[PDB]
Write a protein that binds this ligand. Structure first.
Ligand SMILES: *[C@@H]1O[C@H](CO)[C@@H](O)[C@H](O)[C@H]1NC(C)=O
Ligand SMILES: *[C@@H]1O[C@H](CO)[C@@H](O)[C@H](O)[C@H]1NC(C)=O
Lengths: 189, 13, 179
Protein backbone atom coordinates (compact mmCIF):
# COMPACT_ATOMS: atom_id res chain seq x y z
CA UNK A 1 0.00 0.00 0.00
CA UNK A 2 1.74 3.14 -1.28
CA UNK A 3 -1.22 5.54 -1.36
CA UNK A 4 -0.08 8.92 0.04
CA UNK A 5 -0.94 9.59 3.70
CA UNK A 6 -1.98 12.87 5.33
CA UNK A 7 -1.84 13.42 9.10
CA UNK A 8 -3.35 16.07 11.36
CA UNK A 9 -2.32 16.22 15.01
CA UNK A 10 -3.49 18.41 17.87
CA UNK A 11 -1.81 18.60 21.28
CA UNK A 12 -3.53 20.60 24.03
CA UNK A 13 -0.76 20.89 26.58
CA UNK A 14 -0.97 22.01 30.20
CA UNK A 15 2.40 22.80 31.79
CA UNK A 16 2.48 22.95 35.62
CA UNK A 17 5.21 24.54 37.74
CA UNK A 18 4.90 24.01 41.52
CA UNK A 19 1.54 22.31 41.14
CA UNK A 20 -1.10 24.80 40.06
CA UNK A 21 0.85 27.86 41.26
CA UNK A 22 2.10 28.61 37.72
CA UNK A 23 0.33 27.07 34.73
CA UNK A 24 0.99 27.54 31.01
CA UNK A 25 -1.48 26.30 28.39
CA UNK A 26 -0.28 25.46 24.86
CA UNK A 27 -2.78 24.67 22.06
CA UNK A 28 -0.68 23.23 19.21
CA UNK A 29 -1.76 22.18 15.70
CA UNK A 30 0.35 20.00 13.38
CA UNK A 31 0.30 18.93 9.75
CA UNK A 32 2.30 15.67 9.61
CA UNK A 33 5.07 16.67 12.08
CA UNK A 34 4.99 20.40 11.32
CA UNK A 35 3.47 22.64 13.98
CA UNK A 36 1.77 25.38 11.96
CA UNK A 37 -0.24 27.42 14.49
CA UNK A 38 -0.37 27.61 18.28
CA UNK A 39 -2.15 29.34 21.14
CA UNK A 40 0.17 30.12 24.05
CA UNK A 41 -1.43 31.34 27.27
CA UNK A 42 1.72 33.52 27.68
CA UNK A 43 0.57 35.44 24.58
CA UNK A 44 -3.24 35.27 24.72
CA UNK A 45 -3.66 34.97 20.93
CA UNK A 46 -2.88 32.46 18.21
CA UNK A 47 0.40 32.79 16.35
CA UNK A 48 1.38 31.13 13.10
CA UNK A 49 4.44 28.95 13.60
CA UNK A 50 4.89 28.54 9.83
CA UNK A 51 3.32 30.28 6.84
CA UNK A 52 0.96 27.28 6.57
CA UNK A 53 -0.83 28.51 9.71
CA UNK A 54 -1.18 32.24 8.95
CA UNK A 55 -4.82 31.97 7.76
CA UNK A 56 -5.78 30.19 11.00
CA UNK A 57 -4.12 32.74 13.32
CA UNK A 58 -5.70 35.62 11.42
CA UNK A 59 -9.14 33.99 11.37
CA UNK A 60 -9.22 32.71 14.96
CA UNK A 61 -7.73 35.95 16.35
CA UNK A 62 -10.65 37.86 14.82
CA UNK A 63 -13.10 35.83 16.97
CA UNK A 64 -12.96 37.35 20.46
CA UNK A 65 -15.24 34.63 21.88
CA UNK A 66 -12.91 31.87 20.65
CA UNK A 67 -9.96 33.74 22.20
CA UNK A 68 -11.69 34.15 25.54
CA UNK A 69 -12.32 30.38 25.65
CA UNK A 70 -8.60 29.81 25.10
CA UNK A 71 -7.62 32.49 27.63
CA UNK A 72 -9.74 30.80 30.32
CA UNK A 73 -8.25 27.32 29.68
CA UNK A 74 -5.44 27.68 32.28
CA UNK A 75 -8.25 27.77 34.87
CA UNK A 76 -11.21 25.90 33.39
CA UNK A 77 -9.18 23.07 31.79
CA UNK A 78 -5.57 22.84 33.02
CA UNK A 79 -6.16 23.59 36.70
CA UNK A 80 -9.36 21.55 36.69
CA UNK A 81 -7.79 18.41 35.23
CA UNK A 82 -4.79 18.71 37.51
CA UNK A 83 -7.22 18.43 40.42
CA UNK A 84 -8.83 15.35 38.89
CA UNK A 85 -5.62 13.36 38.36
CA UNK A 86 -3.04 14.65 40.82
CA UNK A 87 -3.59 11.94 43.47
CA UNK A 88 -2.74 8.99 41.19
CA UNK A 89 -0.23 10.73 38.88
CA UNK A 90 1.68 13.61 40.51
CA UNK A 91 1.65 11.62 43.76
CA UNK A 92 2.06 8.12 42.30
CA UNK A 93 5.01 6.39 43.99
CA UNK A 94 6.23 2.87 43.20
CA UNK A 95 9.49 1.67 44.67
CA UNK A 96 11.91 -0.48 42.66
CA UNK A 97 12.68 -4.15 42.94
CA UNK A 98 16.47 -4.40 42.94
CA UNK A 99 18.30 -7.51 41.66
CA UNK A 100 22.06 -8.09 41.30
CA UNK A 101 23.17 -10.84 38.92
CA UNK A 102 26.51 -11.55 37.21
CA UNK A 103 27.17 -11.60 33.47
CA UNK A 104 29.92 -11.51 30.79
CA UNK A 105 31.01 -8.68 28.47
CA UNK A 106 31.78 -11.34 25.86
CA UNK A 107 31.84 -15.16 25.92
CA UNK A 108 34.51 -15.59 28.58
CA UNK A 109 35.45 -18.02 31.29
CA UNK A 110 34.58 -15.88 34.33
CA UNK A 111 31.80 -13.42 35.04
CA UNK A 112 33.26 -9.93 34.58
CA UNK A 113 30.04 -7.87 34.73
CA UNK A 114 27.80 -7.19 37.73
CA UNK A 115 24.28 -6.18 36.68
CA UNK A 116 22.19 -4.15 39.09
CA UNK A 117 18.67 -4.52 37.71
CA UNK A 118 16.21 -1.91 39.03
CA UNK A 119 12.63 -2.73 38.02
CA UNK A 120 9.08 -1.50 38.25
CA UNK A 121 9.58 1.97 39.76
CA UNK A 122 7.70 5.28 39.29
CA UNK A 123 8.46 8.10 38.71
CA UNK A 124 11.47 8.10 36.43
CA UNK A 125 14.20 9.95 38.33
CA UNK A 126 16.53 7.48 40.05
CA UNK A 127 20.15 7.31 41.17
CA UNK A 128 22.02 4.00 41.10
CA UNK A 129 25.61 3.72 42.34
CA UNK A 130 28.09 0.85 42.72
CA UNK A 131 30.35 0.32 45.74
CA UNK A 132 33.29 -2.03 46.28
CA UNK A 133 34.27 -2.60 49.92
CA UNK A 134 32.46 0.64 50.78
CA UNK A 135 34.11 2.97 48.21
CA UNK A 136 32.08 4.09 45.24
CA UNK A 137 33.16 2.49 41.95
CA UNK A 138 32.79 5.18 39.29
CA UNK A 139 34.93 3.61 36.53
CA UNK A 140 33.60 0.99 34.15
CA UNK A 141 29.94 1.75 34.90
CA UNK A 142 27.53 1.51 31.97
CA UNK A 143 23.75 1.47 31.84
CA UNK A 144 20.71 1.01 29.64
CA UNK A 145 19.61 4.42 30.82
CA UNK A 146 16.02 4.95 31.87
CA UNK A 147 13.54 2.60 30.16
CA UNK A 148 9.77 3.20 30.00
CA UNK A 149 7.80 -0.04 30.17
CA UNK A 150 4.69 1.77 28.89
CA UNK A 151 2.59 0.66 31.88
CA UNK A 152 3.43 3.52 34.29
CA UNK A 153 6.65 1.86 35.46
CA UNK A 154 10.31 2.21 34.57
CA UNK A 155 13.36 0.00 34.68
CA UNK A 156 17.10 0.40 34.30
CA UNK A 157 20.13 -1.91 34.40
CA UNK A 158 23.37 -0.48 35.77
CA UNK A 159 26.43 -2.63 35.09
CA UNK A 160 29.87 -2.59 36.69
CA UNK A 161 32.75 -4.05 34.69
CA UNK A 162 34.91 -5.84 37.25
CA UNK A 163 36.80 -9.07 37.90
CA UNK A 164 35.42 -10.19 41.29
CA UNK A 165 37.88 -11.54 43.85
CA UNK A 166 37.12 -13.60 46.94
CA UNK A 167 36.71 -11.38 49.96
CA UNK A 168 35.15 -8.49 48.03
CA UNK A 169 31.65 -7.21 48.77
CA UNK A 170 29.85 -5.35 45.99
CA UNK A 171 26.96 -3.02 46.79
CA UNK A 172 24.39 -1.62 44.39
CA UNK A 173 22.68 1.40 46.02
CA UNK A 174 19.40 2.86 44.71
CA UNK A 175 17.91 6.25 45.59
CA UNK A 176 14.40 7.11 44.43
CA UNK A 177 11.57 9.44 45.52
CA UNK A 178 9.53 6.46 46.74
CA UNK A 179 12.23 5.48 49.26
CA UNK A 180 12.98 7.16 52.58
CA UNK A 181 16.57 5.86 52.69
CA UNK A 182 18.83 4.27 50.05
CA UNK A 183 17.96 0.75 49.00
CA UNK A 184 21.10 -1.45 48.99
CA UNK A 185 21.71 -4.95 47.59
CA UNK A 186 24.98 -6.75 48.13
CA UNK A 187 26.71 -9.43 46.09
CA UNK A 188 29.63 -11.62 47.17
CA UNK A 189 32.08 -13.77 45.23
CA UNK B 1 -13.41 13.98 39.42
CA UNK B 2 -14.74 14.46 35.85
CA UNK B 3 -12.09 14.89 33.16
CA UNK B 4 -12.59 17.95 30.97
CA UNK B 5 -11.70 17.81 27.31
CA UNK B 6 -11.03 20.93 25.49
CA UNK B 7 -12.38 21.42 21.98
CA UNK B 8 -10.11 21.69 18.96
CA UNK B 9 -10.44 24.90 16.99
CA UNK B 10 -12.14 24.65 13.60
CA UNK B 11 -10.36 26.24 10.64
CA UNK B 12 -12.52 27.82 7.90
CA UNK B 13 -13.28 26.51 4.64
CA UNK C 1 8.57 21.92 34.17
CA UNK C 2 7.20 19.98 37.13
CA UNK C 3 4.51 18.20 35.10
CA UNK C 4 2.78 18.15 31.71
CA UNK C 5 -0.70 16.87 30.82
CA UNK C 6 -1.43 16.55 27.10
CA UNK C 7 -4.71 15.90 25.31
CA UNK C 8 -3.28 14.41 22.11
CA UNK C 9 -5.38 13.76 19.03
CA UNK C 10 -4.74 12.73 15.47
CA UNK C 11 -6.59 11.93 12.29
CA UNK C 12 -5.05 10.09 9.34
CA UNK C 13 -6.23 9.96 5.70
CA UNK C 14 -7.00 7.92 3.63
CA UNK C 15 -7.13 5.41 6.48
CA UNK C 16 -9.76 7.53 8.28
CA UNK C 17 -8.03 6.51 11.49
CA UNK C 18 -8.42 8.72 14.55
CA UNK C 19 -7.13 8.74 18.09
CA UNK C 20 -7.82 10.67 21.28
CA UNK C 21 -5.83 10.21 24.46
CA UNK C 22 -4.44 11.89 27.55
CA UNK C 23 -0.78 11.66 28.53
CA UNK C 24 0.89 12.62 31.83
CA UNK C 25 4.67 13.06 31.73
CA UNK C 26 4.95 10.61 28.83
CA UNK C 27 2.54 7.92 30.14
CA UNK C 28 -0.97 7.31 28.81
CA UNK C 29 -3.83 7.98 31.25
CA UNK C 30 -6.59 6.83 28.94
CA UNK C 31 -7.65 6.80 25.33
CA UNK C 32 -11.11 6.69 23.77
CA UNK C 33 -12.08 3.60 21.78
CA UNK C 34 -13.66 5.44 18.86
CA UNK C 35 -15.72 2.51 17.55
CA UNK C 36 -17.24 1.63 20.94
CA UNK C 37 -17.25 5.27 22.15
CA UNK C 38 -15.75 4.08 25.45
CA UNK C 39 -13.05 5.43 27.77
CA UNK C 40 -10.18 2.91 28.10
CA UNK C 41 -8.07 3.51 31.21
CA UNK C 42 -4.42 2.53 30.95
CA UNK C 43 -4.46 1.15 34.52
CA UNK C 44 -7.77 -0.09 35.94
CA UNK C 45 -7.29 1.88 39.18
CA UNK C 46 -7.60 5.13 37.16
CA UNK C 47 -11.25 4.44 36.26
CA UNK C 48 -12.24 4.26 39.92
CA UNK C 49 -10.80 7.72 40.66
CA UNK C 50 -12.02 9.62 37.58
CA UNK C 51 -14.34 9.49 34.59
CA UNK C 52 -14.47 10.94 31.08
CA UNK C 53 -17.42 11.44 28.73
CA UNK C 54 -16.05 9.47 25.76
CA UNK C 55 -18.66 10.96 23.43
CA UNK C 56 -16.91 14.33 23.59
CA UNK C 57 -13.79 12.85 22.01
CA UNK C 58 -15.67 12.16 18.78
CA UNK C 59 -16.40 15.86 18.34
CA UNK C 60 -12.67 16.65 18.46
CA UNK C 61 -11.94 13.97 15.85
CA UNK C 62 -14.63 15.42 13.58
CA UNK C 63 -13.04 18.87 13.75
CA UNK C 64 -9.60 17.32 13.21
CA UNK C 65 -10.86 15.49 10.10
CA UNK C 66 -12.30 18.74 8.75
CA UNK C 67 -9.05 20.61 9.52
CA UNK C 68 -7.08 17.84 7.80
CA UNK C 69 -9.02 18.33 4.55
CA UNK C 70 -8.38 22.07 4.80
CA UNK C 71 -4.65 21.71 5.56
CA UNK C 72 -4.17 19.00 2.93
CA UNK C 73 -5.47 21.38 0.28
CA UNK C 74 -3.58 24.36 1.73
CA UNK C 75 -0.38 22.29 1.44
CA UNK C 76 -1.06 21.52 -2.27
CA UNK C 77 -1.61 17.88 -1.26
CA UNK C 78 1.88 17.40 0.19
CA UNK C 79 1.83 13.94 1.82
CA UNK C 80 3.68 12.67 4.88
CA UNK C 81 7.21 11.26 4.64
CA UNK C 82 7.42 7.77 6.18
CA UNK C 83 9.81 7.56 9.14
CA UNK C 84 10.52 3.89 9.97
CA UNK C 85 10.62 2.76 13.62
CA UNK C 86 13.43 1.71 15.91
CA UNK C 87 12.48 -1.52 17.66
CA UNK C 88 13.75 -2.95 20.94
CA UNK C 89 12.80 -6.19 22.68
CA UNK C 90 13.25 -6.42 26.45
CA UNK C 91 11.75 -8.25 29.40
CA UNK C 92 9.76 -6.72 32.25
CA UNK C 93 12.11 -8.17 34.90
CA UNK C 94 15.23 -10.36 35.24
CA UNK C 95 14.66 -13.65 33.49
CA UNK C 96 14.39 -16.82 35.53
CA UNK C 97 13.76 -20.22 34.00
CA UNK C 98 10.14 -21.30 34.56
CA UNK C 99 9.29 -17.95 36.31
CA UNK C 100 6.52 -16.04 34.50
CA UNK C 101 7.68 -12.85 32.79
CA UNK C 102 6.68 -10.46 29.99
CA UNK C 103 8.39 -9.68 26.69
CA UNK C 104 8.06 -6.00 25.74
CA UNK C 105 8.36 -4.86 22.14
CA UNK C 106 9.08 -1.11 22.13
CA UNK C 107 8.41 0.50 18.74
CA UNK C 108 9.75 4.05 18.61
CA UNK C 109 10.22 7.15 16.47
CA UNK C 110 7.96 6.37 13.55
CA UNK C 111 5.28 7.98 11.43
CA UNK C 112 2.60 7.65 10.13
CA UNK C 113 0.94 5.87 13.10
CA UNK C 114 0.26 2.63 11.19
CA UNK C 115 2.19 -0.52 12.08
CA UNK C 116 1.75 -4.31 11.91
CA UNK C 117 3.34 -6.14 14.87
CA UNK C 118 3.59 -9.90 15.36
CA UNK C 119 5.15 -11.90 18.16
CA UNK C 120 6.84 -15.08 16.96
CA UNK C 121 7.85 -18.05 19.09
CA UNK C 122 10.16 -20.48 17.29
CA UNK C 123 9.20 -18.67 14.10
CA UNK C 124 5.43 -19.11 14.50
CA UNK C 125 2.94 -16.32 15.33
CA UNK C 126 1.70 -16.34 18.93
CA UNK C 127 -1.54 -14.59 19.90
CA UNK C 128 -2.37 -15.97 23.35
CA UNK C 129 -2.12 -13.36 26.09
CA UNK C 130 -0.72 -10.51 23.98
CA UNK C 131 -1.61 -6.87 24.48
CA UNK C 132 -0.59 -3.50 23.08
CA UNK C 133 -0.92 0.21 23.61
CA UNK C 134 -2.36 2.74 21.20
CA UNK C 135 0.04 5.04 19.39
CA UNK C 136 1.71 7.27 21.92
CA UNK C 137 2.86 10.79 20.99
CA UNK C 138 6.46 11.93 21.15
CA UNK C 139 7.74 15.45 21.71
CA UNK C 140 9.18 15.42 18.18
CA UNK C 141 5.63 14.55 16.97
CA UNK C 142 6.53 11.07 15.79
CA UNK C 143 4.95 8.12 17.61
CA UNK C 144 5.85 5.20 19.82
CA UNK C 145 4.03 2.03 20.83
CA UNK C 146 4.37 -0.99 23.12
CA UNK C 147 3.44 -4.62 22.52
CA UNK C 148 3.51 -7.20 25.32
CA UNK C 149 3.78 -11.01 25.47
CA UNK C 150 3.54 -12.84 28.82
CA UNK C 151 5.66 -15.95 28.68
CA UNK C 152 7.37 -18.72 30.62
CA UNK C 153 11.16 -18.57 30.08
CA UNK C 154 12.73 -21.81 28.84
CA UNK C 155 15.90 -22.84 27.05
CA UNK C 156 13.67 -24.36 24.34
CA UNK C 157 12.01 -21.22 22.93
CA UNK C 158 13.22 -18.24 20.94
CA UNK C 159 11.14 -15.14 20.33
CA UNK C 160 10.95 -12.33 17.80
CA UNK C 161 8.94 -9.16 17.57
CA UNK C 162 8.21 -8.60 13.87
CA UNK C 163 7.34 -5.04 12.85
CA UNK C 164 6.07 -3.92 9.45
CA UNK C 165 5.84 -0.22 8.59
CA UNK C 166 5.62 1.61 5.26
CA UNK C 167 9.00 3.21 5.92
CA UNK C 168 10.67 -0.22 6.17
CA UNK C 169 11.92 -1.99 3.05
CA UNK C 170 11.71 -5.42 4.74
CA UNK C 171 9.97 -6.44 7.98
CA UNK C 172 12.07 -5.74 11.07
CA UNK C 173 12.61 -8.75 13.35
CA UNK C 174 14.04 -8.18 16.82
CA UNK C 175 15.21 -11.33 18.57
CA UNK C 176 15.17 -12.55 22.17
CA UNK C 177 16.31 -15.79 23.78
CA UNK C 178 17.36 -17.03 27.20
CA UNK C 179 21.05 -16.13 27.70
C1 LIG D 1 1.04 25.98 -3.14
O1 LIG D 1 1.06 26.50 -4.48
C2 LIG D 1 0.63 27.87 -4.58
C3 LIG D 1 0.65 28.22 -6.05
O2 LIG D 1 -0.64 28.05 -6.64
C4 LIG D 1 1.54 28.77 -3.75
O3 LIG D 1 1.07 30.12 -3.77
C5 LIG D 1 1.61 28.28 -2.31
O4 LIG D 1 2.59 29.03 -1.60
C6 LIG D 1 1.98 26.80 -2.25
N1 LIG D 1 1.95 26.33 -0.87
C7 LIG D 1 2.79 25.41 -0.38
C8 LIG D 1 3.81 24.86 -1.33
O5 LIG D 1 2.72 25.04 0.79
C1 LIG E 1 -0.66 -4.57 7.45
O1 LIG E 1 -1.23 -5.72 6.80
C2 LIG E 1 -2.31 -5.42 5.89
C3 LIG E 1 -2.83 -6.75 5.39
O2 LIG E 1 -2.16 -7.84 6.02
C4 LIG E 1 -1.80 -4.52 4.77
O3 LIG E 1 -2.85 -4.23 3.85
C5 LIG E 1 -1.23 -3.24 5.39
O4 LIG E 1 -0.69 -2.38 4.40
C6 LIG E 1 -0.14 -3.59 6.40
N1 LIG E 1 0.38 -2.38 7.02
C7 LIG E 1 1.68 -2.11 7.08
C8 LIG E 1 2.05 -0.81 7.73
O5 LIG E 1 2.53 -2.88 6.62
Amino acid sequence: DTRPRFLEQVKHECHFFNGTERVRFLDRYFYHQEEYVRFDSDVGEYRAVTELGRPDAEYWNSQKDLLEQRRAAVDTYCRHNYGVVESFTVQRRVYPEVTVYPAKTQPLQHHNLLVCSVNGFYPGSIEVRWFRNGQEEKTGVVSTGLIQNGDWTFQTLVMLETVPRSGEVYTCQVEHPSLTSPLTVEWRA
Amino acid sequence: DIFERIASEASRL
Amino acid sequence: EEHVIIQAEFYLNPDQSGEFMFDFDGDEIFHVDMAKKETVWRLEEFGRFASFEAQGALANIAVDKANLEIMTKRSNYTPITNVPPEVTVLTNSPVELREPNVLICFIDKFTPPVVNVTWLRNGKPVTTGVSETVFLPREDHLFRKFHYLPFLPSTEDVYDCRVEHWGLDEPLLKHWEFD
